Amino acid sequence: HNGEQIKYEHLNVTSSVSDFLTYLNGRFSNMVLGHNGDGINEVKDARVD
Amino acid sequence: MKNSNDRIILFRKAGEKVDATKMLFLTEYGLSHEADTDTEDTMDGSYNTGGSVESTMSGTAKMFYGDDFADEIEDAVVDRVLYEAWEVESRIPGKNGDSAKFKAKYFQGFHNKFELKAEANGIDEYEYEYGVNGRFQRGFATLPEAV
Amino acid sequence: MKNSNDRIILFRKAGEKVDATKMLFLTEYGLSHEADTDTEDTMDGSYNTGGSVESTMSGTAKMFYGDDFADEIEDAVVDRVLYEAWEVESRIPGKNGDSAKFKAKYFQGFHNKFELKAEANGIDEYEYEYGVNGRFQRGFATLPEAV
Amino acid sequence: NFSKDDNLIELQTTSQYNPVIDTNISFYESDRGTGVLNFAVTKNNRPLSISSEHVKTFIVLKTDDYNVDRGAYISDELTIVDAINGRLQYVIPNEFLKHSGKVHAQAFFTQNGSDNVVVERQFSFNIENDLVSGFDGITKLVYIKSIQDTIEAVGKDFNQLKQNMADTQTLIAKVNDSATKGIQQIEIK
Amino acid sequence: VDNFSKDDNLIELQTTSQYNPVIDTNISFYESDRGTGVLNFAVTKNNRPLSISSEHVKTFIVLKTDDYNVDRGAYISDELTIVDAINGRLQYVIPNEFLKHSGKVHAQAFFTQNGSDNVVVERQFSFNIENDLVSGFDGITKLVYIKSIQDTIEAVGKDFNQLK
Amino acid sequence: SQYNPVIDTNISFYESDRGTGVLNFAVTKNNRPLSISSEHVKTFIVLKTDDYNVDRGAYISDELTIVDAINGRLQYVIPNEFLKHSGKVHAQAFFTQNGSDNVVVERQFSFNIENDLVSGFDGITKLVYIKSIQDTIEAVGKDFNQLKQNMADTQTLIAKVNDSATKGIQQIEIKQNEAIQ
Numbered sequence: 001h002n003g004e005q006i007k008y009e010h011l012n013v014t015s016s017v018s019d020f021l022t023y024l025n026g027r028f029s030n031m032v033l034g035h036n037g038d039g040i041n042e043v044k045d046a047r048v049d
Numbered sequence: 050m051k052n053s054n055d056r057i058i059l060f061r062k063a064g065e066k067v068d069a070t071k072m073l074f075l076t077e078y079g080l081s082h083e084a085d086t087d088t089e090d091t092m093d094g095s096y097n098t099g100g101s102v103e104s105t106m107s108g109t110a111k112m113f114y115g116d117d118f119a120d121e122i123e124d125a126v127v128d129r130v131l132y133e134a135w136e137v138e139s140r141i142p143g144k145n146g147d148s149a150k151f152k153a154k155y156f157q158g159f160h161n162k163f164e165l166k167a168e169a170n171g172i173d174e175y176e177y178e179y180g181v182n183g184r185f186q187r188g189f190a191t192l193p194e195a196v
Numbered sequence: 197m198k199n200s201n202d203r204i205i206l207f208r209k210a211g212e213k214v215d216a217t218k219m220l221f222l223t224e225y226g227l228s229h230e231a232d233t234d235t236e237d238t239m240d241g242s243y244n245t246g247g248s249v250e251s252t253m254s255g256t257a258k259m260f261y262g263d264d265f266a267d268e269i270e271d272a273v274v275d276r277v278l279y280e281a282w283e284v285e286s287r288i289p290g291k292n293g294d295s296a297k298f299k300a301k302y303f304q305g306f307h308n309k310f311e312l313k314a315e316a317n318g319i320d321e322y323e324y325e326y327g328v329n330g331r332f333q334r335g336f337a338t339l340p341e342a343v
Numbered sequence: 344n345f346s347k348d349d350n351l352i353e354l355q356t357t358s359q360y361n362p363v364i365d366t367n368i369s370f371y372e373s374d375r376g377t378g379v380l381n382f383a384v385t386k387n388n389r390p391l392s393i394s395s396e397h398v399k400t401f402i403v404l405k406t407d408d409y410n411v412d413r414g415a416y417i418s419d420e421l422t423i424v425d426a427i428n429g430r431l432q433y434v435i436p437n438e439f440l441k442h443s444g445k446v447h448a449q450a451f452f453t454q455n456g457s458d459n460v461v462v463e464r465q466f467s468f469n470i471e472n473d474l475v476s477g478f479d480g481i482t483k484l485v486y487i488k489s490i491q492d493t494i495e496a497v498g499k500d501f502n503q504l505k506q507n508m509a510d511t512q513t514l515i516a517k518v519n520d521s522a523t524k525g526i527q528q529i530e531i532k
Numbered sequence: 533v534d535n536f537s538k539d540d541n542l543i544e545l546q547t548t549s550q551y552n553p554v555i556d557t558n559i560s561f562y563e564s565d566r567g568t569g570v571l572n573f574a575v576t577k578n579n580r581p582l583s584i585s586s587e588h589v590k591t592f593i594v595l596k597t598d599d600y601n602v603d604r605g606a607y608i609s610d611e612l613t614i615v616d617a618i619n620g621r622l623q624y625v626i627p628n629e630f631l632k633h634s635g636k637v638h639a640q641a642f643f644t645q646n647g648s649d650n651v652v653v654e655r656q657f658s659f660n661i662e663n664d665l666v667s668g669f670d671g672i673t674k675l676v677y678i679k680s681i682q683d684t685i686e687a688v689g690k691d692f693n694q695l696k
Numbered sequence: 697s698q699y700n701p702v703i704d705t706n707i708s709f710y711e712s713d714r715g716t717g718v719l720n721f722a723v724t725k726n727n728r729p730l731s732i733s734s735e736h737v738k739t740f741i742v743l744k745t746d747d748y749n750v751d752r753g754a755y756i757s758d759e760l761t762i763v764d765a766i767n768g769r770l771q772y773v774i775p776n777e778f779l780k781h782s783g784k785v786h787a788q789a790f791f792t793q794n795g796s797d798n799v800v801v802e803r804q805f806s807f808n809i810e811n812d813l814v815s816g817f818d819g820i821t822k823l824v825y826i827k828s829i830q831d832t833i834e835a836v837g838k839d840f841n842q843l844k845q846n847m848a849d850t851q852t853l854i855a856k857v858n859d860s861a862t863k864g865i866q867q868i869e870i871k872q873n874e875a876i877q
Contacts, residue, residue, distance in 0.1 A: 081311040184274060
């Protein structure tokens with residue numbers, strides 16, 4: 001089977017495994033090599049629509 | 050680190066359940082396991098045959114007056130009676146409830162050879178070769194008379 | 197220029213991935229490669245057949261109380277289990293990122309023979325012959341416990 | 344490129360008595376800015392990820408003839424490259440080369456927020472002498488480039504804050520100029 | 533506890549009455565970690581893991597440097613911070629102090645019956661901790677640099693308060 | 697749960713300094729007063745008043761005064777301008793022997809200094825040993841990072857004030873790009 005096929009069902013949530021694994025890898029990559037800082041200002045700016 | 054004389058070696062006939070004894074005045078004792086593996090060639094590669102293993106042990110000892118055991122051995126080699134032997138290493142006891150019995154190897158087979166030898170003005174020495182006849186089992190065994 | 201005792205020699209069973217150990221108290225260790233080439237004659241000339249090479253190594257060592265490895269060897273020769281060994285020369289590290297691991301030869305085969313020996317008032321010595329079962333690979337390998 | 348970026352040493356971040364090792368790395372005296380040490384960190388058996396955001400890594404370096412009247416020692420940061428793979432490199436300084444002989448090194452990391460740190464190997468290292476010499480840097484040098492760069496960067500950040508607070512008065516002029524140029528571009532086309 | 537410590541050690545502390553002389557453990561900390569030294573003890577009765585909970589036996593570990601003396605050395609008995617009450621997994625975070633006292637350090641475990649004076653003790657061990665170029669190398673420059681940073685903060689604070 | 701760090705070095709604070717804030721410290725190496733000099737050792741002291749917000753900070757840093765080295769005493773005369781702050785003045789002393797050992801003994805304490813002179817020379821005093829190059833940054837790292845974060849807060853306030861008009865620039869450019877259509 002291709003990885004896009006198989007379903008990973010969490011609570012009330014449907015998604016494949018390839019997409020989910022790519023999302024996990026992207027999370028890891030962002031948390032590691034993603035620049036950070038001024039989180040409070042980031043949140044207070046994200047408050048806008 | 051083990052002095053050879055720590056190795057203790059017992060024999061007895063299978064029929065005589067009660068009987069027990071030990072070999073005395075060993076000078077040189079040697080065990081052996083001989084694997085017969087002769088690969089026969091193949092075009093695409095080679096395969097290593099798994100053959101039988103004829104393990105045997107040869108020991109030499111002395112022969113004194115207060116013992117006839119060696120005579121029992123030179124009897125068995127001829128009469129081809131079965132025997133069973135115990136290669137027990139002393140100073141190595143059990144682990145839980147087997148302390149009185151020390152580690153040993155047990156194996157049953159025949160005595161394949163006896164050869165004694167004399168030398169003017171010297172004690173006569175008898176050598177014996179014993180075939181083990183199969184797999185040698187392990188465990189612990191108890192000595193007689195605390196020696 | 198290499199003192200023999202620099203040669204370090206390890207074994208382990210293929211199945212037991214985690215397991216690791218080393219041979220201790222070597223006295224004489226010897227490797228061997230034996231080429232079977234018997235030319236069969238020809239009218240116009242002669243041709244040198246290229247035959248298999250049964251490489252093997254024989255080592256003798258001593259046998260003490262804080263070790264049973266030699267017993268594992270005398271087990272394998274009988275049970276004819278597979279093993280794999282490492283002839284690593286210490287004081288010879290990698291070249292780029294492999295410094296912790298020193299040069300070695302790796303080969304997998306069976307133990308073809310075990311023969312120990314005793315001598316009144318002396319430590320018992322066990323010898324072993326190991327068949328390599330094919331080409332011996334090269335590279336570097338890491339020691340355990342820094343020794 | 345021309346530089347000695349071929350070497351590579353692995354740092355096992357494990358507590359199993361990883362002893363000192365002669366990495367067999369012999370730079371030379373007349374080598375400036377081209378002596379590089381490629382470190383690759385490993386947690387247990389595979390590479391340990393890293394980042395300049397969460398943690399901050401440094402290395403200590405000390406010659407073998409280190410004395411109070413004559414020696415050499417430093418401690419400075421790293422240059423993480425391919426962090427996810429647990430890889431990084433250190434550009435050997437220029438003042439340290441002048442001191443030749445054996446060298447011991449070390450690489451220690453500090454996790455931000457907690458200041459709980461980690462030390463890896465305490466490995467060895469070599470440096471040789473060449474014929475381009477004669478000047479003697481016998482004066483022992485000991486500078487904590489970490490805190491030195493810390494204070495320098497704090498000063499630079501204060502100065503940049505000052506310049507930005509000064510520019511705050513120019514932002515209205517920027518807005519007006521941008522709007523005027525937009526109106527001009529509209530009226531043009 | 534975090535995913536930054538060493539935590540590459542599995543000590544088999546087996547409650548066996550037969551014999552458990554000593555463990556010359558192969559382990560180091562380099563004296564400069566001082567923020568993350570983790571010891572992952574296991575627990576077994578004969579060959580299987582134990583099942584110890586908080587309501588059940590409480591845990592204790594005693595650490596004692598090699599040359600302990602009322603004037604010089606180190607000695608402390610603290611908790612274990614149980615991880616898994618099923619397989620007997622005990623992660624103990626070494627203090628910030630001992631890693632300053634270079635050299636060797638012996639240790640031992642200790643289990644107290646929750647609700648009775650009965651206790652149990654496990655096999656010893658010895659997790660050496662080596663020296664490091666980080667914890668040495670000078671006895672002035674550190675003071676010089678702390679003084680320099682103090683001067684810099686005390687100075688820049690004036691301009692900072694001014695511009696603020 | 698006792699301790700015995702093997703440096704046998706300590707810097708004690710005399711309780712008999714309740715008058716005029718003449719901080720008279722003593723040194724003890726191997727239960728012995730250490731004979732010091734100007735060259736053979738080094739010293740340092742820092743003092744900060746009670747938690748003033750930013751305005752009245754008695755943030756002073758100065759070396760010591762060798763009153764009696766052969767006896768092992770170190771005097772520090774409190775500046776008159778400093779003791780005006782009657783707030784509890786936390787103090788961090790640092791002594792360093794430079795005897796081929798990386799010992800930098802730090803003494804953290806405080807008291808209840810009054811506008812006239814040192815008062816209530818109390819407070820649970822502790823001592824630490826800087827035996828590693830990471831806490832030299834952490835010794836004063838507390839207030840250092842505090843001021844760093846204050847500077848960063850002012851910087852982000854300035855950045856928000858600037859973005860208030862950068863957003864106007866964005867609105868201008870987008871409205872113009874829409875009008876040209």
